[PDB]
Design a protein around this ligand. Structure first.
Ligand code: HEM
Ligand code: STR
Ligand code: K
Ligand code: MG
Length: 407
């Protein structure tokens, strides 16, 4: 690996540990290459926090010099991560709060109390599936049987996605996220997803129900109402995020606890909270690797560095979770007892901070203890260190997770 001043992010995710350490070492601001496209990566905790609140960094792709010049187009395999419709995800400034408010109100801890029974029912159902799958000592994929379906069920219940449509959504997302999907097919899948959620919003407009989509469509009376584009945009964002991140969180938490059985014991015996184990998982091995992307509306002076107007800026959240300045020398270790376990920014910071953090945390806090209580001798049927990532550049997406129920 001969010295380079640009760090190429390997889209096959062949050396995530090496790559994450190289980003930390090269940071807190360093040049990266995303499939032939240059950007800056923010890899330090403090600098990330400053920049995530800097109003000169915007989501709007039309602020991107390479987009303005036509240098980057829809042929770029990562383009679907940023060139999306109007929503809380793409907006900044005073307009942004309007696009967030119904969702944040709906996803408060207290409002989520009402969704808890549903989450509990789905966890119980999928554990029944695990039991069936793992009978007579057979090897089971913890991902396909338990972790992969659960968050789709949950976010679907919340948004009003029919039971019978969820399999198709998962199929689309898998194609959408895989770097291997041919770009023409990925763009088709993106159109097909948009068509689906467009019709879903038309369905809920004609016949509203007790779900968040209906609430985005029909606001309290006072308004002003969200456009069709905004409702669909929020909808797609909530489902995509709600599913994809949460799967990873469940799987990494299990892998972390199973490879650190002494720390699994701490949570089982009630000496450390499950919630604390989940925070350290978010810090150490969290759902987001990189977040695309922000752009400078003008020059941003950082004292001994300048991010030029038009430049693309990525938040390298995995690298950021391994910040030694913040977490100490053992940042690269999983340690649910560390003082800084909950001091991560793995859900972001500033205006665009994750609105679903309480739901993510709640799903994990129900699912994890339920899994280990039900199957106390759960163990890997494959060395945990041999579980590969899927080729998904921006997301910490585990391929499969072979276990035995034990015993
Ligand atoms: C489970 C683990 C999760 C992690 C690690 C996570 C992480 C994040 C991060 C880091 C951002 C902001 C990126 C940035 O602006 O720099 C974010 C934004 C967002 N997340 Fe979460 N998230 C999680 C679960 C969820 C869930 C359950 C939902 C929905 C129910 C969700 C919906 C969103 C939406 C809609 C945005 C965009 C908000 C905005 O830009 O204003 N994510 N997520
Ligand atoms: C940080 C993270 O993993 C989540 C939070 C917001 C999510 C994005 C929300 C908007 C969105 C809509 C889509 O239709 C494609 C997926 C994307 C582009 C999502 C990709 C994963 C993101 C980036
Ligand atoms: K578009
Ligand atoms: Mg050099």
């Amino acid at each position: 690996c001969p010295h380079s001043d640009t760090l190429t992010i390997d889209p096959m995710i062949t050396d995530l540990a090496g790559e994450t350490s190289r980003l930390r070492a090269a940071g807190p601001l360093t040049r990266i290459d995303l499939l032939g496209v240059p950007a800056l990566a923010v890899t330090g905790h403090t600098l990330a926090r400053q920049l995530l609140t800097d109003t000169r960094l915007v989501k709007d792709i039309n602020a991107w010099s390479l987009w303005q010049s036509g240098t980057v187009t829809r042929q770029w395999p990562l383009i679907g991560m940023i060139d999306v419709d109007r929503s809380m995800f793409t907006v900044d400034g005073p307009e942004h709060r309007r696009l967030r408010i119904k969702t944040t109100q709906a996803l408060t801890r207290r409002r989520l109390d009402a969704l808890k029974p549903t989450i509990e029912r789905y966890v119980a159902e999928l554990l029944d599936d695990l039991e069936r799958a793992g009978a007579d000592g057979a090897v089971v994929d913890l991902k396909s049987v338990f972790a992969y379906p659960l968050p789709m069920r949950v976010i679907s219940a919340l948004m009003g996605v029919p039971s019978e449509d969820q399999e198709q959504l998962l199929t689309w997302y898998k194609a959408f996220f895989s770097i291997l999907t041919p770009q023409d097919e990925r763009l088709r899948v993106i159109d097909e997803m948009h068509g689906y959620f467009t019709e879903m919003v038309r369905r809920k407009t004609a016949e509203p129900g007790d779900d968040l989509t209906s609430a985005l469509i029909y606001a309290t009376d006072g308004e002003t109402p969200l456009t069709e584009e905004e409702v669909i945009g929020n909808l797609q964002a909530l489902v995509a995020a709600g599913h994809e991140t949460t799967v990873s969180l469940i799987l990494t938490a299990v892998r972390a606890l199973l490879s650190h059985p002494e720390q699994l014991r701490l949570v089982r015996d009630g000496e450390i909270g499950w919630e604390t184990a989940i925070e350290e998982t978010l810090r150490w091995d969290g759902p987001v690797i990189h977040l695309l992307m922000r752009f400078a509306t003008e020059d941003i002076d950082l004292g001994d560095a300048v991010i030029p107007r038009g430049e693309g800026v990525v938040m390298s959240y995995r690298a950021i979770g391994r910040d030694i300045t913040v977490h100490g020398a053992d940042a690269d270790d999983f340690d649910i007892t560390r003082a800084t376990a909950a001091r991560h920014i793995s859900f972001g910071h500033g205006p665009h901070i994750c609105p679903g953090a309480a739901l993510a945390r709640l799903e994990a806090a129900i699912a994890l203890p339920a899994l280990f209580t039900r199957f106390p001798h759960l163990h890997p049927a494959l060395p945990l260190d041999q579980i590969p990532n899927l080729p998904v550049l921006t997301q910490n997406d585990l391929s499969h997770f072979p276990i035995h129920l034990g015993r």
